[PDB]
Amino acid sequence: MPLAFCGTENHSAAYRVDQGVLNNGCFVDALNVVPHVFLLFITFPILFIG
Amino acid sequence: QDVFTTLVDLKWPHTLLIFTMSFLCSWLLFAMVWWLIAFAHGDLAPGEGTNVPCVT
Amino acid sequence: ERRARFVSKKGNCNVAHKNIREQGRFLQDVFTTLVDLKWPHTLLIFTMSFLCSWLLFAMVWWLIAFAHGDLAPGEGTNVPCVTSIHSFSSAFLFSIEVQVTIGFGGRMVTEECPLAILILIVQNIVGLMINAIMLGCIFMKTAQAHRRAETLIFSKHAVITLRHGRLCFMLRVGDLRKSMIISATIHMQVVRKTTSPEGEVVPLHQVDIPMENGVGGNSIFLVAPLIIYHVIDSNSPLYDLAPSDLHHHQDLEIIVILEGVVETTGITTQARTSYLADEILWGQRFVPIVAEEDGRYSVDYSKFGNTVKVPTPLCTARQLDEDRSLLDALT
Ligand SMILES: CCCCCCCCCCCCCCCCCC(=O)OC[C@H](COP(=O)(O)OC[C@H](N)C(=O)O)OC(=O)CCCCCCCCCCCCCCCCC
Ligand SMILES: CCCCCCCCCCCCCCCCCC(=O)OC[C@H](COP(=O)(O)OC[C@H](N)C(=O)O)OC(=O)CCCCCCCCCCCCCCCCC
Ligand SMILES: CCCCCCCCCCCCCCCCCC(=O)OC[C@H](COP(=O)(O)OC[C@H](N)C(=O)O)OC(=O)CCCCCCCCCCCCCCCCC
Ligand SMILES: Nc1ncnc2c1ncn2[C@@H]1O[C@H](COP(=O)(O)OP(=O)(O)OP(=O)(O)O)[C@@H](O)[C@H]1O
Ligand SMILES: *[C@@H]1O[C@H](CO)[C@@H](O[C@@H]2O[C@H](CO)[C@@H](O)[C@H](O)[C@H]2NC(C)=O)[C@H](O)[C@H]1NC(C)=O
Ligand SMILES: [K+]
């Protein structure tokens, strides 16, 4: 029972990208993690210098 | 403005931390990019199917 | 138009060259040109150099595979010279792996054909050479200290006031960083269209000017702001500047050259500034700046360039020294 970003239940089938990837309710959440991890890792080197 | 000159003035402990943070931030950011592109490609759900993974 | 400045207040000059017989020296200094370029342009050339090299050798790897005929489907009757090359894009990825030295190893180089072995040698050597060259250019760019010259700060405009009897052209220069500037030096030049009795005409004659130092040298130890002045002796070309003659179209300019090796990177930097004719305030001493706090000093950069008015004769230096000498002789 390891960690899964999407849902492990129902034999971990929330990863299929049929019927468009924007319809994969988990995938849009991953698209919403990109901007945050972008700013963390583009400003930590900036801030730590100061 | 002169980040390079600023980095030189930093102590070695803080320079090592910034050295570490710079590499770690680049490594982890592109890890998300590789993970997301594979996940969008659909080659992340395992199975004996017609799909051929972009990143094995 | 109104009045061309030799060097702008920010330190950049304004001289425009023309009719240069281009000998290709601009192109010849490839490494120096790269250093001068801006970081966005440097990164573009950095990216294009690597991408062109990667794509050039990628075409070669595809070409040798196509010539060997190992990319068409085969069933045991062949051994490809570069394994798993069944598309041009495979050759492109293989080129990336070699020159960057990633070496995934899914597309190996076999022992079969010798031509791929020579090309592997060439690509490795070219990759190392380009990596070494880009290192050199990046090391020289990261060692740049022209952005340090920006932290050097001069007064908005300079003054000419009496100090210790005589008259001197004063000035203030400050440093904002906590770091030190080793072996600093403050040159000073007057730029005037100076005509000569013999018949010569000079469009912009640059006359050097002493710094009125204690020991008559150019060395300056700059930590706090300093009132760096110039004693207007008999020989100084400022000996005949009438205060009434300070208006706009007065052909004058005071160059200042603050040099000194930066301690951090070890690179020498210049600071430049020009005081125009109308950018001089006659007879206004500088505001005292270096205050004292509990156990430590305090510089008030808010009052860096403020000048208060101090009484003084509105006479040329020649009309002052001569008058004082006559009065002493009469007495
Ligand atoms: C914080 C990011 C800001 C920039 C975001 C993207 C902007 C793209 C710019 C492209 C050019 C188009 C507009 C030009 C804007 C210029 C910005 C700029 O110069 O500031 C960058 C800064 C400071 O420099 P400055 O003092 O302002 O430069 C002189 C200025 N022109 C002047 O007025 O005199 O320079 C510095 O002081 C150093 C900044 C380095 C930033 C590096 C961040 C860490 C990255 C590590 C992770 C890599 C992520 C990779 C993602 C890849 C995804 C595919
Ligand atoms: C008054 C201080 C206020 C507080 C500000 C700083 C805070 C520091 C806390 C004080 C304790 C620090 C102990 C650190 C011990 C490990 C680091 C280490 O060994 O480097 C210590 C030394 C440098 O020491 P210094 O006295 O600062 O240097 C003298 C000089 N005048 C200067 O300051 O400059 O280093 C050298 O002399 C250079 C040797 C480099 C070799 C290191 C190789 C491996 C480094 C580690 C990398 C791996 C990191 C792993 C991270 C994993 C993250 C997931
Ligand atoms: C090689 C990249 C390949 C593609 C990957 C893209 C992902 C980029 C993220 C990772 C980049 C790595 C970060 C390294 C940090 C280094 C910091 C650094 O070099 O200084 C930050 C730079 C410096 O700007 P500046 O002060 O104006 O330049 C010097 C001055 N102007 C001079 O003449 O000394 O400030 C900047 O410049 C901002 C740095 C951000 C880099 C983004 C590069 C794209 C530029 C696109 C520009 C297009 C238009 C260009 C027009 C320019 C017109 C003048
Ligand atoms: N417009 C110019 N642009 C660049 N360099 C110049 C220019 N004019 C002269 N020089 C350089 O000045 C030197 C000689 O200058 P001068 O004009 O007195 O002689 P010259 O007849 O041009 O010389 P030469 O026959 O050596 O080219 C040479 O080093 C020449 O390259
Ligand atoms: C869950 O995945 C299954 C396919 O693996 C689909 O529905 C399942 O069907 C089987 C039939 O034996 C049972 O496990 C359940 O009836 C369903 N599982 C559920 C509901 O978790 C379907 O693709 C997925 N379920 C949904 C609601 O989409
Ligand atoms: K390797």
Task: Assign 3-class secondary structure to C117-130.
Answer: HHHHHHHHHHHHHH
d(CA C98, CA C128): 11
Q: Do C192 and C271 form a contact (C-beta atoms < 8 A)?
A: no
Q: Is B12 in the pocket of ligand 2 (CB under 6 A)?
A: yes
d(CA C234, CA C212): 13
Q: Provide the experimental method for this PDB entry.
A: cryo-EM
For A17, list phi and psi in degrees, rounded to 5.
Answer: -110, 20
Residues from chain A contacting residue B31 (CB–CB below 8 Å): none
| Nearest-5° Cα angle at C68, C65 to C70 | 65
* C27-146: CATH class: mainly alpha
Q: Is C124 annotated as a binding residue?
A: no
Helix (H) or strand (E) holding C169: strand C167-169
Residues from chain B contacting residue C178 (CB–CB below 8 Å): 9
d(CA C102, CA C300): 55
- Which residue's structure tokens are 């250019």? C137
Residues from chain B contacting residue C151 (CB–CB below 8 Å): 2
d(CA C274, CA C256): 7
Which of B22, B29, B39 would you mutate first to test chain A, the one with the most A CBs within 10 A? B39
d(CA C21, CA A43): 48
Q: Which of A6, A8, A9, A10 to mutate to test the pocket of ligand 5 (most atoms within 8 A of CB)?
A: A10
Model resolution, angstroms: 3.8
d(CA A41, CA A34): 11
The two structure tokens encoding residue C113: 């054909």
- Out of B28, B36, B45, name the one closest to residue A13 (CB): B45
Environment class of residue C20 by beta-carbon count within 10 Å: exposed (0-12), middle (13-18) or buried (19+)? exposed
d(CA C267, CA C145): 6
Q: Give the largest Cα separation in chain B, rounded.
A: 57
d(CA A35, CA A28): 12
Q: Which of B2, B3, B28 to mutate to test the pocket of ligand 1 (most atoms within 8 A of CB)?
A: B3
Count interface pairs A-B at CB distance under 8 A: 50
Contacts of C185 (CB under 8 A, 6+ apart): C218, C219, C220, C257, C258, C259, C260
Contacts of C305 (CB under 8 A, 6+ apart): C155, C156, C157, C172
Q: Which of C229, C224, C227 is nearest to C180 (CA)?
A: C224
Which of B2, B3, B30, B34 would you mutate first to test chain C, the one with the most C CBs within 10 A? B2
